Each structure stands twice: as structure tokens, then as C-alpha cells.
Design a protein that fits this description.
The chain is mostly beta strands. Helices cover about 15% and strands about 45% of the residues. A 10-stranded antiparallel sheet has the order 5-6-8-9-10-1-2-3-4-7. The longest helix is centred in the C-terminal third of the chain and has 16 residues. Bound molecules: undecane (UND). It is classed as lipid binding protein. The entry lists the keywords cracked beta barrel, mixed alpha/beta, lipid binding protein.
């Protein structure tokens, strides 16, 4: 099982809260997201570099700034619609791509 955090690349995501942690379990195939104010377990598909998932999110009222909420909302909407994941053979960083651009990167670790 590995975990990552986001480093946003697109401005839609500059306000994403920093404590979101994304986990993938290689044994049972589970994907979760965890933070102080959001949780979600993914129903998902990942084929040919294309990832799409529904995280069934819970969110704490009043915990986020308006800008953070919009960024979070947009992120889960984008993940549902589908993104392309670009890994590499050097380390565990993954670029998340959509609509001709890099939207964000996943950096391994908390
Ligand atoms: C090998 C699959 C690892 C990808 C898990 C991350 C879920 C995609 C959402 C990123 C915010």
C-alpha cells in the first residue's frame, strides 16, 4: 500500500487543503482519501492510463474556506469524469492530466 499527497499544477487547485492523503492498497485494490475534514472510499476503474472514480465524499460543515470548497468539489468532479495518470520509472510521482494540461501531481508520502 502506497500513499500520496497532491501538489496542484492548475490554478483550480491552488486552494486544495494540504492534508488530503490518497491511499492505494495493492492487495485488495482499495483507494481511499483521508483528511481532517474530508473522507472517501473510491469506486473506480483504471485502464490504459485512464482513471475514473467516485469517492462518496463526507465533508465537515464550515471547516473549509469558500475557495477550498470549490477546489475540492472540482477535484472530485474531475476524478469522476476521468483523468490520465502518467507515472515514471524513477520514483512514485504521478502526473494527473486532463484536457491537454497537467492538473496536478501526486507526490509519495504524507
Ligand atoms: C495505481 C493507482 C494509484 C492512484 C491513486 C490515486 C487516486 C486518483 C485521485 C488522485 C487525486
Amino acid at each position: 500500500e502506497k500513499e500520496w499527497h497532491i501538489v496542484p499544477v492548475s490554478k483550480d487547485y491552488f486552494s486544495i487543503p494540504n492534508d488530503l492523503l490518497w491511499s492505494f492498497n495493492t492487495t485488495n485494490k482499495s483507494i481511499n482519501v483521508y483528511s481532517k475534514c474530508i473522507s472517501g472510499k473510491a469506486v473506480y476503474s483504471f485502464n490504459a492510463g485512464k482513471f475514473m472514480g467516485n469517492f462518496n465524499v463526507k465533508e465537515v460543515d464550515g471547516c473549509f474556506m469558500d475557495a477550498q470548497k470549490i477546489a475540492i468539489d472540482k477535484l472530485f468532479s474531475m476524478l469522476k469524469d476521468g483523468v490520465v495518470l502518467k507515472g515514471n520509472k524513477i520514483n512514485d510521482t504521478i502526473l494527473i492530466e486532463k484536457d491537454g494540461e497537467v492538473k496536478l501531481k501526486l507526490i509519495r508520502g504524507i
